[PDB]
Assembly symmetry: C2
Homo-oligomer: 188 residues x 2
């Protein structure tokens, strides 16, 4: 069934607890000192990472070419260790998936794994009043405190949890191309 061993390896080497004015979130480190967190975390210029106050060197709230929220924020942090590079486990394209795990790492739940079954490419979602694109959906109840939970299948990190109603959960897609080294562009 589920790739529990894979989800477990991602959680140990590549997640941290992040805390902003908005609360705590599971935060996925991706490569070097680059990580992701849901845009609703409202990242500022400092953040707590495992309860250590950390300078945010860069934060990019992703939107698509329709200027619509994608609900991922890519952050660059001022800290000493690099994350293990997990870009090769990121999907190239939008897709549907079988048998996913949602894993959570917070002060409340420091390591918890939830199979969520099939994951469908859902598309548009109205996410607490913000229109949002590129959403993945799983038919599992959602509870508070799971935001940023990392959604995996064996060998693939496919997105991060961003919301739910009492019956479904929603994750924001991760694509490999969000994290390729690139072009000289004024971003702020």
């Amino acid at each position: 069934g589920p790739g529990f061993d894979f989800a477990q390896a991602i959680m140990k080497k590549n997640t941290v607890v992040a805390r902003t004015e908005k609360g705590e979130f599971t935060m996925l480190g991706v490569h070097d000192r680059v990580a992701v967190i849901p845009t609703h975390a409202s990242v500022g210029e400092t953040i707590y990472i495992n309860d250590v106050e950390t300078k945010v060197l860069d934060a990019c709230a992703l939107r698509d070419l329709t200027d619509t929220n994608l609900e991922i924020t890519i952050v660059k942090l001022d800290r000493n260790q690099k994350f293990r590079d997990i870009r090769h486990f990121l999907p190239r394209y939008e897709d549907d998936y079988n048998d996913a795990v949602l894993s959570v790492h917070t002060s409340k739940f420091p390591n918890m794994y939830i199979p969520v079954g099939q994951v469908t490419n859902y598309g548009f979602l109205n996410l607490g009043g913000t229109p949002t694109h590129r959403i993945l959906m799983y038919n599992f109840p959602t509870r508070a405190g799971q935001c940023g939970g990392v959604v995996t299948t064996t060998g693939k990190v496919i997105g991060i949890h961003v919301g739910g109603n009492g019956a479904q959960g929603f994750a924001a897609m991760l694509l490999h191309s969000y994290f390729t080294d690139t072009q000289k562009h004024h971003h702020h």
Copy 2:
């Protein structure tokens, strides 16, 4: 690492959500219509099982020969399906264990898996003011709503969660001999 596949098989075929005046508990079905739940659930003469009201035909709050609480209650239920017989997965003796999973099944968390690392035979525990014997301990924080969570290692169901402080969790041991067909004795 952890036997996630084993814990998952136990959860699917052998647990139900039980609800008493005291709240909800993960309930482990053991064989026929016999199950266990923590003594602190305060089982009466009817109980809800997956939100269906069910007659309790028998409840035995286990104590040892020192007349001390063991915090397991064995219940016999009036319901149509039998549980898959999992007695052969019960340990013969007290023991310590490597790499356990704690799995929870409630309306809040319908399927959640938590590795808790090493499990030690701890013995005496003062459990909210009730002295209690035969306790297993794991060095993992405890959160509310996990009572009755089933503690496994691959091929062994070793106990059920009964409490914790902010740093450790405690499970009540399950032993094979709690469930062998037996002698003619007035029990009530």
